[PDB]
Amino acid sequence: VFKSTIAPEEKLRYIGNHKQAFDIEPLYPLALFEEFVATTGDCIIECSGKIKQDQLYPARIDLQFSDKHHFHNIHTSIDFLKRAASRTDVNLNLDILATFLAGNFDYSKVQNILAGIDLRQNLGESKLKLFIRIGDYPAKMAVAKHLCNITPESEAMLRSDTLHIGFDFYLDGRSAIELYPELKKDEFNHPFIYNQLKTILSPEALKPLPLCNLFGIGLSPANEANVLYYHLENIEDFLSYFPINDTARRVHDFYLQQEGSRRMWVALSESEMKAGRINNVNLYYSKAFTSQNP
Ligand SMILES: CC(C)=CCC/C(C)=C/CSP(=O)(O)OP(=O)(O)O
Numbered sequence: 001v002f003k004s005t006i007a008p009e010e011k012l013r014y015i016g017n018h019k020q021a022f023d024i025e026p027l028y029p030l031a032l033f034e035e036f037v038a039t040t041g042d043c044i045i046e047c048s049g050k051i052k053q054d055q056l057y058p059a060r061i062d063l064q065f066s067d068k069h070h071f072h073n074i075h076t077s078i079d080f081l082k083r084a085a086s087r088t089d090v091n092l093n094l095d096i097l098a099t100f101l102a103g104n105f106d107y108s109k110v111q112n113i114l115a116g117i118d119l120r121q122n123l124g125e126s127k128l129k130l131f132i133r134i135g136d137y138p139a140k141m142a143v144a145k146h147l148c149n150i151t152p153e154s155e156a157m158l159r160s161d162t163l164h165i166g167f168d169f170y171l172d173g174r175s176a177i178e179l180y181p182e183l184k185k186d187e188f189n190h191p192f193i194y195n196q197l198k199t200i201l202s203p204e205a206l207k208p209l210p211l212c213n214l215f216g217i218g219l220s221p222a223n224e225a226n227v228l229y230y231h232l233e234n235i236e237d238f239l240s241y242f243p244i245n246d247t248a249r250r251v252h253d254f255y256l257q258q259e260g261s262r263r264m265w266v267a268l269s270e271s272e273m274k275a276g277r278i279n280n281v282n283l284y285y286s287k288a289f290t291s292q293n294p
Pocket residue numbers: 050118166178218223224225226227228267268269270272280281282
């Protein structure tokens with residue numbers, strides 16, 4: 001009769017489990033982000049850990065809006081970014097996002113919105129995140145490609161029908177854009193497309209594809225090399241095929257015990273694919289929150 005709302009406690013429970021698993025202190029602006037999460041409707045929450053050798057960076061949480069209210073979802077997400085940026089010790093520079101959104105932006109061409117954080121004990125190295133997926137939008141695909149410095153060799157990876165765009169805003173004023181072209185299982189398993197992958201990507205980067213239903217590549221001037229994203233169909237497959245170190249294994253062993261998706265994402269570098277032990281890896285786990293009449 002009325003629109004349903006998922007209780008904030010259910011969403012914050014999932015985030016709270018992650019905070020407790022990895023000893024996350026209330027870094028700024030985690031409390032503001034939890035209030036933001038409380039105000040949302042149906043969503044998917046993604047928690048992740050970034051492993052660098054024996055160092056775990058676990059204060060990484062993204063929210064994906066499940067409904068299609070893209071204009072209003074972007075604007076509540078940006079309102080979070082700007083409120084967090086109000087504190088005098090923080091400097092956020094949203095110029096690259098202002099450039100992307102400039103003019104008469106067509107919000108009917110948006111497909112997904114995500115808002116998130118990656119917080120560090122060193123306030124300056126902390127960042128806020130915004131993701132916008134657009135489809136069939138030539139003008140704004142071109143803007144994003146220009147902001148991302150897409151050269152040939154990289155342009156071949158980008159699709160025309162859809163483009164997942166990420167914005168990173170560091171709390172010291174630095175900012176970066178990232179493009180994430182993706183292929184679905186049905187596409188990368190087709191011999192035409194695989195043979196084009198064989199030219200731009202080593203066999204090592206193609207190795208996990210049988211385990212996945214989605215494959216993506218992160219392209220950003222901020223990256224040392226392209227970042228490979230694998231959406232594993234079965235979280236239980238991970239430790240059989242990837243030789244991760246003890247620090248990453250602690251993250252994964254905890255998430256093997258959690259309620260949530262049966263799938264997971266792993267992100268790695270191609271060089272870290274031609275090597276014995278994986279010591280630089282991001283692991284992403286999620287849980288969906290859906291109600292009866294959202
Ligand atoms: C060393 C390289 C290029 C990749 C290995 C480690 C890695 C997966 C890095 C990107 S970390 P970040 O940009 O914070 O993660 P996203 O939100 O973009 O997924």
